[PDB]
Amino acid sequence: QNLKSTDRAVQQMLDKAKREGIQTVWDRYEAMKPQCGFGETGLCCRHCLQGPCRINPFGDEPKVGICGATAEVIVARGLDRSIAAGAAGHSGHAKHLAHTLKKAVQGKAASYMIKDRTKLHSIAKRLGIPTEGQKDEDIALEVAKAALADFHEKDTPVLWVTTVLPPSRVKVLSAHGLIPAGIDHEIAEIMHRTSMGCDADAQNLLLGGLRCSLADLAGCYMGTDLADILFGTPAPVVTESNLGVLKADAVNVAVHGHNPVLSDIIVSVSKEMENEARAAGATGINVVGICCTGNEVLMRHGIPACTHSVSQEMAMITGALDAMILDYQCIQPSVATIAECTGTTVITTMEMSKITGATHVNFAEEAAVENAKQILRLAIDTFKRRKGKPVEIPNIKTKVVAGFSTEAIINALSKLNANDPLKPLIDNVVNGNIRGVCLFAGCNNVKVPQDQNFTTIARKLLKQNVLVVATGCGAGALMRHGFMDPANVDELCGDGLKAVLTAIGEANGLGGPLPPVLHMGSCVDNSRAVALVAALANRLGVDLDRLPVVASAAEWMHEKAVAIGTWAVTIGLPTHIGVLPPITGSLPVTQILTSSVKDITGGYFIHELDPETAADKLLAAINERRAGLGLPW
Amino acid sequence: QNLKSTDRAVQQMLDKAKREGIQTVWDRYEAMKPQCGFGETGLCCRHCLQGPCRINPFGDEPKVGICGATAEVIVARGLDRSIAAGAAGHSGHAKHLAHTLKKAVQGKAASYMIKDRTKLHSIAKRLGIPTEGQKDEDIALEVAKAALADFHEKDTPVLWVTTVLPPSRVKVLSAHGLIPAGIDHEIAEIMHRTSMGCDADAQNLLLGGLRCSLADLAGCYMGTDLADILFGTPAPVVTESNLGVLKADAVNVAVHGHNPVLSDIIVSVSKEMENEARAAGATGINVVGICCTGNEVLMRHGIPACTHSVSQEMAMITGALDAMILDYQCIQPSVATIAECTGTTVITTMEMSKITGATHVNFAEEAAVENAKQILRLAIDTFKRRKGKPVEIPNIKTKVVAGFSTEAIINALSKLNANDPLKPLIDNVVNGNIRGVCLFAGCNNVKVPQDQNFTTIARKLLKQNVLVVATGCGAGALMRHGFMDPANVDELCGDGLKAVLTAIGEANGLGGPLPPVLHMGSCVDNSRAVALVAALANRLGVDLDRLPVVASAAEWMHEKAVAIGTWAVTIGLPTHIGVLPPITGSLPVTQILTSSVKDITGGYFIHELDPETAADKLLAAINERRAGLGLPW
Ligand code: SF4
Ligand code: SF4
Ligand code: FES
Ligand code: FES
Ligand SMILES: [Fe+3]
Ligand SMILES: [Fe+3]
């Protein structure tokens, strides 16, 4: 099983699934091999009913699509549509939160409210919305209206791009025509230009993709902003992760998906029905997190994280998962069929994300609390049904310190320098105690033994004094392997980084260091990392493509992750990816994405499947940035 | 060559291309066979980087996608993305026209203006925009603003759906949750729900697709509305079609693509530079049309149509095409490479639709006339270069009567009944002189010998007294085979239909009939057919799914055509399609689209590759509708 996952709890459930005959994501992957080489290389097009068209990577015909589309065009069109789909996911998420905030402050959804007034006012100031003499609900109404207006064309560009990046970066992007005009406008324009008989120039197509990736960045940043207003900005929290957080004696309820508009309510309501859970023979309701919805409630409430991404089915294989409450994105639809064998109640809640065989509960913000009680009562029933059955919960979990929003990081640094909090961090970059910053982001992918790239790369970077931050299932991988436990700082961290994490931790009255890796939240919360390094850029008076900052989507899978990697490149970052996207069938497209885009944005993709090589390449990228600043390395 | 095209002019150029070694769309199709059966059946998914995934239509593994996506889900997600891409094309077109109208009436683009004041005022009344006491430019500004607002969520649904369909139809659709909230909103939501780990229920997915197809209908109707305001509502015109409209002695300039915002200017400006063309040794500038941009200027100005769709490369093979002026959609990118051998100057004009190897001229409405003169001067140069070369223009063309906008059809009928113009048409449906109405729409497709399905089906329907209307390349196929020449009414039409076309034509002072087939315009002008049959429904007091009206996308290709076919079904029409979309790999999805969707919308797809069988099935559908009205048949 260690060829499938490096997580020992996942390995134990893989053994249980095998002897019980339950097919897993790894079994379905094995049944897919050999995968189609045209699709893997990107040399396949189905954009019209004259297709499907394919191009042989090498050899004889077919050499060109039926309409005349070249390899370069077919590859760039497919990539562009992946970016648009990712942008559609992150901005559907943000749009939902914008409608929720509007409903809350219009008196139409009383379970939601302005919880972070300070964040509301700073966002309003950032957008140019007046606050002086204005009532909070009216400021919030204007912020929500501004968020919805960024989805379409108007007299301004997308403000959740132009107001969140360094001004010099906005100017570079504007010069190349890369600033999005509207989030859904850009998504639709990608879909149009990539349809048959439209854009057929690789460079033109890819420039469109870069602009659409910034529409995705806007949706991410808007989602984080709105979630913080509604549910609170995260601050440091202590909790646990991996399958051992399940409790045989409790009603185990997983929140799974991305949008915490309902799961945040699930968390608060579950506390109230403790006695009702006790009446059925449970110690209580044990809410646990899967994927990014789990990250959201981990960051804000310390809800323990059960598992992530590729291994999500193994939480049900324990026999102890009474309910899985789903919203949307990254949910393997296999969970609906596996539920028949494991007894889990799988519940969908969102109109546009249903799974055949799962029970649906039509969540509405107006009725959020009643929905949560109906959902939780289905879980309590399910706990009752497994009275006196054996469950196999692996006795495996790690300690997780998390909650490092950008505000929290700045506050932590402010204990070393009250009026200039970023300066202690920059001081330690300059003197070499911090070599640079690496963001780990994105998914697991069944093609890669689960977590192997994240942990192998993180171990090498930490030894070399890199400050490592992480989001989404990159944070999930690192948390499940102990990288968010401060007890492991001595083992994992170079002496310079250890010195800095210790100094910051001791100044925050901890008696010990910050954890080896800083958990910055969910996938939309990659926007928090942007806010941090944008602040660092603005304090140094340089653009992002001069900072020693890199990103690694080390095991990425989802179209959302392709969007994120692409806007990481667009805002100027060297961006490692650990699974090749379908681009190798066009050398000109590969060359743009790995080399010549540097001349446009200063960022670039680093394609490297071998994680030890990837770490060396990321260190090289960091050290080159150090040299360009005249720093030793 | 008659296995490739039924058009004799196309056959002659196919012979020329063969002996000159110029590869054609048919050669590239042959080089693609056998095409991939997973793609052809729809059992392939590339929506995440764990793919590509495929499912064997029959036999052993793989049976399911790696994430657990079933055949039903994979097929429905792929179809939904095709619909969204089509909606993105038609509404990108309409959005461009909305910005052009706004610029024109703000004094920023003086080459554009309100040409159809009556249409402006009727659209404003339809939208609920006040006209009394308002200045035309202010009414137009409000109409343009309303058009742009339909792209995003707001306090009303998409008005270019809810105000253009019969009220009973809007109620049926609203009950099923099918009314779009915003055009680009629906496109983005499709892209989101079809991304990995999201919607995984075939019925839910397909309902989303139906709603997105109505977003496409809105873009079509908005595009026709705005084009008529800016350039004039079409009225009956006489012109010619096929390659023989090229003139060896003239500067032959093709306008090609879909959006006539520039080609309409090309038409008017070309008239002015006649003397400048004469100075270079031409008789003049001969503007000819390809594809829907050609249809637009054929409908409004009688510009002759050169060719269409699959055969577009053969216009250049003549050696006499001096320029091809491109905007976007349905342009084979092969034209840019074929130009090197034929001497044609291929010119792109739209920022998001470039072709490597083609010259680009950045069209802007503000500078429309100067751009046209620069473009036309490139064509005049090219004419000069082919001084004293042999060209091979097939001496083959047909006469084309066209310009049957819905307003023109109603006006024609008004000569038989001034105060109740639809009544003479309904009178003749009831008494059997008109069996029913069939709309031919959509593309040619290299899989089908060019025009064979359109003409075979049209011949059988006309003999059976069906009133036949046509748009896009369906109109192109029928026009190139003589179906828009009133001299062929005796040969083609049953006695009842002949009687009606003659009576209408004689009442319009023609001395002869309307043509056998009524050309209703471009692909967005399928919206005109909707306006006609919606008017008929409202005059009869029934919904569209009770009228003897059907549609045939007999040789369809483009994602735009998939969108159109889907909204034809959604508004209640039996809709024949002549090339299978990638759905046969899921029997449940095929059953929804061909049968059970009847229970939702009253419309349904008729899958029939054999055109004689297709005609029999369309007649059966018409006659069933007749029976449901209690009419003889
Ligand atoms: S768009 Fe071109 S390459 Fe793609 S399926 Fe159609 S003919 Fe083939
Ligand atoms: S979304 Fe599912 S079926 Fe599609 S490529 Fe990814 S794992 Fe395969
Ligand atoms: S030929 Fe396999 S992905 Fe299309
Ligand atoms: S396997 Fe051929 S279309 Fe994907
Ligand atoms: Fe995840
Ligand atoms: Fe066409």
Curated annotation (Swiss-Prot), chains A, B:
It catalyses: CO + 2 oxidized [2Fe-2S]-[ferredoxin] + H2O = 2 reduced [2Fe-2S]-[ferredoxin] + CO2 + 2 H(+). CDD domains: CODH (cd01915). Its cofactor is [4Fe-4S] cluster; [Ni-4Fe-5S] cluster. The keyword Iron-sulfur applies. [Ni-4Fe-5S] cluster binds at H258, C292, C330, C443, C473, C523. One of its GO terms (biological process) is generation of precursor metabolites and energy. It is a peripheral membrane protein. Cluster B is an all-cysteinyl-liganded 4Fe-4S cluster; cluster C is a mixed Ni-Fe-S cluster which is the active site of CO oxidation. Cluster D is also an all-cysteinyl-liganded 4Fe-4S cluster that bridges the two subunits of the CODH dimer. This is Carbon monoxide dehydrogenase 2. The lineage of its organism: Bacteria, Bacillati, Bacillota, Clostridia, Thermoanaerobacterales.
